[PDB]
Amino acid sequence: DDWEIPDGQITVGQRIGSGSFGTVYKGKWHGDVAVKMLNVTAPTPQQLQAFKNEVGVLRKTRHVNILLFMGYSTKPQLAIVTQWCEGSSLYHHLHIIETKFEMIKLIDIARQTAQGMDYLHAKSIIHRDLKSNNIFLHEDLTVKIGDFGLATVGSILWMAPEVIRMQDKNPYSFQSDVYAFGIVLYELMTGQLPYSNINNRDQIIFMVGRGYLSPDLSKVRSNCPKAMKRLMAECLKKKRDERPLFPQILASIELLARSLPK
Ligand SMILES: C1=C2C=c3cc(-c4cn(C5CCNCC5)nc4-c4ccncc4)ccc3=C2N=N1
Numbered sequence: 001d002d003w004e005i006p007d008g009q010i011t012v013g014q015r016i017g018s019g020s021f022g023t024v025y026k027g028k029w030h031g032d033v034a035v036k037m038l039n040v041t042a043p044t045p046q047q048l049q050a051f052k053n054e055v056g057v058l059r060k061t062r063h064v065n066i067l068l069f070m071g072y073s074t075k076p077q078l079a080i081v082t083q084w085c086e087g088s089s090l091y092h093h094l095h096i097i098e099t100k101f102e103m104i105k106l107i108d109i110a111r112q113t114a115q116g117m118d119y120l121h122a123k124s125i126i127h128r129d130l131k132s133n134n135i136f137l138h139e140d141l142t143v144k145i146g147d148f149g150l151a152t153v154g155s156i157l158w159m160a161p162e163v164i165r166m167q168d169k170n171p172y173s174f175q176s177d178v179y180a181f182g183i184v185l186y187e188l189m190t191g192q193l194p195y196s197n198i199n200n201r202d203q204i205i206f207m208v209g210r211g212y213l214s215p216d217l218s219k220v221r222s223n224c225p226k227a228m229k230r231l232m233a234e235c236l237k238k239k240r241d242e243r244p245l246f247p248q249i250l251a252s253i254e255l256l257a258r259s260l261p262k
Pocket of ligand 1: 017018033034036067080083084086088092136146147
């Protein structure tokens with residue numbers, strides 16, 4: 001029953017990058033797997049908590065749109081094993097290799113992302129770090145939401161105005177994830193990161209915080225549906241209580257998707 005994998009069964013290969021509280025590798029364990037490892041000599045009580053926190057969250061998830069947790073390892077280093085997804089993240093497709101997706105496919109990505117987030121919020125799981133980079137495209141058609149190191153039951157462009165000015169203790173909520181989803185909606189419909197004409201990071205942080213800066217919604221492409229643009233503005237509201245929850249958001253995307261191919 002237990003998910004602890006006996007040591008050395010995981011064959012660590014190519015270093016593919018870094019996630020939250022670890023370095024990610026392409027491993028081999030009963031096929032191709034993604035393994036997030038600590039590569040640190042001795043784990044801190046800080047790093048030990050962050051490990052058991054993520055594993056505890058991941059073992060509560062069983063969904064087609066959530067990155068499938070396969071197991072964990074403690075004996076060599078603190079490692080977490082998930083499924084391998086050929087084809088890079090949504091951030092990579094849109095901003096690195098500049099892949100040109102069709103509107104039908106762009107909305108399908110947004111629908112699956114909302115579908116996975118609805119599954120998390122139903123199980124009272126707040127991602128707290130939802131971004132294009134944590135949204136993974138498996139086989140170029142299936143969306144997988146990954147990296148749950150900051151989940152509770154770094155990147156500023158997806159952070160809500162409430163989150164960016166730390167008051168009070170917990171600015172993270174279901175609606176804070178909605179804003180982060182609002183930004184990935186923007187990215188899909190524009191093909192660009194928000195505030196791209198501004199180079200100063202500290203000026204963006206301050207300007208979103210005080211409520212002077214909001215994403216340029218008129219940047220969306222001409223073939224983007226009016227129902228998509230309207231939903232985008234609802235998710236990107238400065239006040240969190242004026243934002244819809246994912247049960248409502250999912251139903252909105254599913255509605256505009258059916259009256260789209262015609
Ligand atoms: C276990 C994990 C394996 C894992 C892999 C990752 C991850 C990070 N990247 C890179 C990073 C740089 N940009 C391009 C994509 N790709 C993946 C990945 C690879 C295969 N399947 C799923 C995800 C992210 C988070 C986790 C994670 N969190 N817990």
